[PDB]
Every structure is written in structure tokens, then in C-alpha cells.
């Protein structure tokens, strides 16, 4: 029984998501809720966040 | 069993922390880990981060 805490992965995804300047507040809240519920999916969530950030660039 | 909506508080307070220009990279990351781990402490953490930022001003 391996205890995977994902400390590095979570903290990296959080820091990067906060720096994506084109996300809205609702989007950040959705990503953080999904990460808290399933921290194994940090890479999926960060990739999606980056894609939305870029789609919402002025 | 109250849901304290601390996911939304993490999002709002975290953004404020990362927008403090005079904090360094490990300082902002230390604040964010504490916030993620205990979002009930958001106001205390934000206050501490603001005082630290305002004090490290050029």
C-alpha cells in the first residue's frame, strides 16, 4: 500500500494555475475542486487550464 | 455537517498572495501550501503575506 500524497504535483499545478492570467474565477474554483477530490489528475487539470488560458487570451 | 466553501476561499486568497510583487518564489509557495492544507487560515495567511510584502518593498 503505497501512500501517494502528490505534494509536489499539487503545489506545482496550483502555482501555475494562479499565474494563468486569462482564467476566470469560476474556472480556478472548478480546477481546485477537481484537484482536491482527485490529486492524481494534476497533469490533466493543468493541461486543460493552460489550454483554456490560451483560448481566452485577448 | 457544514460545507465551509473553503475551496472558493483558497482560490481568492491564493490569487491575492501570488500578486504581491515583493514576495520571493519560495515565500509565495510556502504560503500557498499552508493555504491549501488549512484554508480556514486564509485571512491570517493573507495578512502575514501582505505585511511581509509591504516590508520587502524596494
Amino acid at each position: 500500500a503505497v501512500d501517494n500524497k502528490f505534494n509536489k504535483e499539487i503545489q506545482n499545478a496550483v502555482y501555475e494555475i494562479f499565474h494563468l492570467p486569462n482564467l476566470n474565477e469560476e474556472q480556478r474554483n472548478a480546477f481546485f475542486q477537481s484537484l482536491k477530490d482527485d490529486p492524481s489528475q494534476s497533469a490533466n487539470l493543468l493541461a486543460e487550464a493552460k489550454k483554456l488560458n490560451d483560448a481566452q487570451a485577448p
Side-chain angles (χ1 to χ4, degrees), chain A residues 2-7 9-45:
Chain A
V2 175
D3 176 24
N4 296 312
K5 298 196 163 312
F6 305 108
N7 299 134
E9 294 80 4
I10 295 160
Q11 290 309 310
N12 170 252
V14 168
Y15 197 76
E16 291 273 345
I17 290 167
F18 276 126
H19 286 79
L20 292 170
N22 306 317
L23 303 182
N24 72 39
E25 177 58 45
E26 289 83 6
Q27 289 169 328
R28 285 189 289 280
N29 294 346
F31 287 123
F32 296 144
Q33 186 62 55
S34 289
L35 188 61
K36 190 151 289 167
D37 292 349
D38 182 9
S40 77
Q41 76 166 327
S42 67
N44 298 93
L45 296 172

